[PDB]
Scaffold this active site. Structure first.
Site, PDB file in Angstrom:
ATOM      1  N   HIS A   1       0.831  -1.203   0.000  1.00  0.00           N
ATOM      2  CA  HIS A   1       0.000   0.000   0.000  1.00  0.00           C
ATOM      3  C   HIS A   1       0.858   1.242   0.000  1.00  0.00           C
ATOM      4  CE1 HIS A   1      -4.130   1.707   0.885  1.00  0.00           C
ATOM      5  NE2 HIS A   1      -3.346   2.768   0.880  1.00  0.00           N
TER       6      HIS A   1
ATOM      7  N   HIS B   1       1.150   5.334  -2.248  1.00  0.00           N
ATOM      8  CA  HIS B   1       0.591   6.205  -3.270  1.00  0.00           C
ATOM      9  C   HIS B   1       1.719   6.882  -4.018  1.00  0.00           C
ATOM     10  CE1 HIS B   1      -3.763   6.352  -2.080  1.00  0.00           C
ATOM     11  NE2 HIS B   1      -3.244   5.844  -0.980  1.00  0.00           N
TER      12      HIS B   1
ATOM     13  N   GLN C   1     -10.214   8.464  -5.718  1.00  0.00           N
ATOM     14  CA  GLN C   1      -9.977   9.225  -4.503  1.00  0.00           C
ATOM     15  C   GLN C   1     -11.168  10.063  -4.059  1.00  0.00           C
ATOM     16  OE1 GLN C   1      -6.854  10.374  -2.101  1.00  0.00           O
ATOM     17  NE2 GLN C   1      -8.977  10.300  -1.346  1.00  0.00           N
TER      18      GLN C   1
ATOM     19  N   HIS D   1     -10.084   1.281   0.078  1.00  0.00           N
ATOM     20  CA  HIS D   1      -9.793   2.092   1.273  1.00  0.00           C
ATOM     21  C   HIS D   1     -11.036   2.007   2.149  1.00  0.00           C
ATOM     22  CE1 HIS D   1      -6.342   3.521  -0.914  1.00  0.00           C
ATOM     23  NE2 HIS D   1      -5.998   4.371   0.032  1.00  0.00           N
TER      24      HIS D   1
ATOM     25  N   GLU E   1     -11.497   4.051   6.640  1.00  0.00           N
ATOM     26  CA  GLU E   1     -10.406   4.847   7.198  1.00  0.00           C
ATOM     27  C   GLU E   1     -10.966   6.081   7.923  1.00  0.00           C
ATOM     28  OE1 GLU E   1      -6.168   7.090   6.122  1.00  0.00           O
ATOM     29  OE2 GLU E   1      -7.547   6.618   4.476  1.00  0.00           O
TER      30      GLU E   1
ATOM     31  N   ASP F   1       2.012   3.301   2.996  1.00  0.00           N
ATOM     32  CA  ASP F   1       0.925   4.195   2.553  1.00  0.00           C
ATOM     33  C   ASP F   1       1.373   5.500   1.866  1.00  0.00           C
ATOM     34  OD1 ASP F   1      -2.196   5.631   3.985  1.00  0.00           O
ATOM     35  OD2 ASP F   1      -1.546   5.240   1.940  1.00  0.00           O
TER      36      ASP F   1
ATOM     37  N   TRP G   1      -0.277  13.955   3.331  1.00  0.00           N
ATOM     38  CA  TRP G   1      -0.708  13.072   4.398  1.00  0.00           C
ATOM     39  C   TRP G   1       0.408  12.657   5.369  1.00  0.00           C
ATOM     40  CZ3 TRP G   1      -2.335  12.727  -0.666  1.00  0.00           C
ATOM     41  CH2 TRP G   1      -3.721  12.752  -0.903  1.00  0.00           C
TER      42      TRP G   1
HETATM   43  N1  LIG Z   1      -4.053   7.870   3.838  1.00  0.00           N
HETATM   44  C1  LIG Z   1      -4.623   8.217   2.769  1.00  0.00           C
HETATM   45  N2  LIG Z   1      -5.972   8.255   2.621  1.00  0.00           N
HETATM   46  C2  LIG Z   1      -6.569   8.637   1.443  1.00  0.00           C
HETATM   47  O1  LIG Z   1      -7.826   8.670   1.347  1.00  0.00           O
HETATM   48  N3  LIG Z   1      -5.860   8.996   0.345  1.00  0.00           N
HETATM   49  C3  LIG Z   1      -4.512   8.995   0.354  1.00  0.00           C
HETATM   50  N4  LIG Z   1      -3.561   9.287  -0.544  1.00  0.00           N
HETATM   51  C4  LIG Z   1      -2.346   9.094   0.042  1.00  0.00           C
HETATM   52  N5  LIG Z   1      -2.483   8.676   1.330  1.00  0.00           N
HETATM   53  C5  LIG Z   1      -3.797   8.593   1.591  1.00  0.00           C
HETATM   54 ZN   LIG Z   2      -3.939   4.719   0.690  1.00  0.00          ZN
END
Ligand SMILES: Nc1nc(=O)[nH]c2nc[nH]c12
Ligand SMILES: [Zn+2]
Ligand SMILES: C[C@H](O)COCC(COC[C@@H](C)O)(COC[C@@H](C)O)COC[C@@H](C)O
Ligand SMILES: [Zn+2]
Length: 422
Positions: free
Chosen positions: A58, A60, A153, A211, A214, A310, A316
């Site tokens: 995981h 990005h 996203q 996802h 979260e 991640d 983030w």
């Molecule tokens: N932790 C994260 N959560 C997200 O929804 N999008 C993201 N894009 C990079 N990291 C993250």
């Molecule tokens: Zn992610």
């Protein structure tokens, strides 16, 4: 060429071993009567530990290395990260994406990672980053096997044309379908977005990676739908639920009910410790919750869970060097997996369990598998984790793709002394 690895320890095995290489595969692994002399064509493990390569399940790569552009995540929340990203997503170019993704990818190779699954934001009419990242996949293939998740996203039903865009991304060749149900405008949208996602995955024979919940909301229960859909389709092993940090706040009676289904469905879980600890608990004052999914209880129940990084140096998450032992380290601490046994087995959380998550077939130190493997300057999992050792050698298809000359520390007492911290 290389034809043998000598003086190697294996997890849970007595003494040293020799690993025979032929045509980029492992032909044989035989015990040793003891330390062997360094021959040419052989690589000396030096009594280090040999394991299959690290996996990063995981990350990005489209957002990597962009921290502080145009603005900073002031609040440090998962929701402001998304606001900052959308600003920076407006300035994405083909070259920018490839440049940054390659940088992080290089760090990853340096750190013994030969398998990577990257989520790419496909809430973009142009699909700039997805198309660029499809090229990076081919470019980097000789060192890393990269899986690409089409990651909506900004929602599937909550974004103009999000369902169409997700599908186009699969047409173009994304390996995995993503979703983000807790971000959809309504609960009903969230649930339906998962029906769509699953229908897409079946239509294109692709894996799934959501996802999932979260968020510190004990009512965010989309994981049960992921598990139910997977079970109904018999596609368990092909399905991964990422984060599920809401589970940290579930009441225990429901969680126990839920676990029955999670175990039957056979789906996979990724927890992301470095980022979870940083972004969860942000709406608590004191006391303040940890926010990682229920790793310890999953392990006890034999539900496959593993650890991702991640985010590396972006809105983030402002830190990172794509280092899996560092991720594992934070995970054991925060999840309170601190027994000797638990810490030593911790390697599985960044190796075997992650490989199961990415659905790999050619994985593991065994005869017949490709000669993909790494050597750590350490006696066992515990020792490597405790000392945060770098990767001594990375071998891919029988060839050394990276090597680290260890640091050397000396103290000057009444005479010079080498420190190794053992
Ligand atoms: N932790 C994260 N959560 C997200 O929804 N999008 C993201 N894009 C990079 N990291 C993250
Ligand atoms: Zn992610
Ligand atoms: C970011 C930095 O550290 C590396 O950039 C060079 C790199 C050049 O393109 C590779 C391709 C096969 O032609 C990849 O380098 C790895 C080599 C040594 O295998 C990627 O740069 C992106 C540009 C092309 O926008
Ligand atoms: Zn191009």
């Amino acid at each position: 060429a290389l034809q043998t690895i000598i003086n190697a320890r294996l997890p849970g095995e007595e003494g040293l071993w020799q690993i025979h290489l032929q045509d980029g595969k492992i032909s044989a692994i035989d015990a040793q009567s003891g330390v062997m002399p360094i021959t040419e064509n052989s690589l000396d493990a030096e009594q280090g530990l040999v394991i299959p390569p690290f996996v990063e399940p995981h990350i990005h790569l489209d957002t990597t290395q962009t921290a502080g552009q145009p603005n900073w995540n002031q609040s440090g929340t998962l929701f402001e990260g998304i606001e900052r990203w959308a600003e920076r997503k407006a300035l994405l170019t083909h070259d920018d994406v490839k440049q940054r993704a390659w940088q992080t990818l290089k760090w990853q190779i340096a750190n013994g990672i030969q398998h990577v699954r990257t989520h790419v934001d496909v809430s973009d009419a142009t699909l700039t980053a997805l198309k660029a990242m499809l090229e990076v996949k081919q470019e980097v293939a000789p060192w890393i096997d990269l899986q690409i998740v089409a990651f909506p996203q900004e929602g599937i039903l909550s974004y103009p044309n999000g369902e169409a865009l997700l599908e186009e991304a699969l047409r173009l060749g994304a390996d995995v379908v993503g979703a983000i149900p807790h971000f959809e405008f309504t609960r009903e949208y969230g649930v339906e977005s998962l029906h769509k996602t699953f229908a897409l995955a079946q239509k294109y024979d692709r894996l799934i990676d959501v996802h999932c919940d979260e968020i510190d909301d004990e009512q965010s229960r989309f994981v049960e739908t992921v598990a139910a859909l997977a079970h109904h389709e018999g596609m368990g092993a092909r399905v991964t639920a990422s984060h599920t940090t809401a589970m940290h706040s579930y009441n225990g009676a429901y969680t126990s009910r839920l676990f029955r289904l999670l175990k039957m469905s056979g789906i996979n879980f990724v927890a992301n410790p470095l980022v979870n600890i940083h972004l969860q608990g942000r709406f608590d004052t004191y006391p303040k919750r940890r926010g990682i999914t229920r790793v310890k209880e999953m392990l006890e129940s034999g539900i496959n869970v593993c650890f991702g990084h991640d985010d590396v140096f972006d809105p983030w998450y402002p830190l990172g060097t794509a280092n899996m032992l560092q991720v594992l380290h934070m995970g054991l601490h925060v999840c309170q997996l601190m027994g000797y046994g638990q810490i030593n087995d911790g390697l599985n959380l960044i190796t075997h369990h992650s490989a199961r998550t990415l659905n790999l077939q050619d994985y593991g130190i065994a005869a017949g598998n490709s000669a993909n493997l790494i050597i750590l300057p350490a006696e066992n999992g515990f020792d490597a984790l405790r000392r945060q050792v770098p990767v001594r050698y990375s071998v891919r298809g029988g060839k050394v793709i990276a090597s680290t000359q260890p640091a050397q520390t000396t103290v000057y007492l009444e005479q010079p002394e080498a420190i190794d911290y053992k």
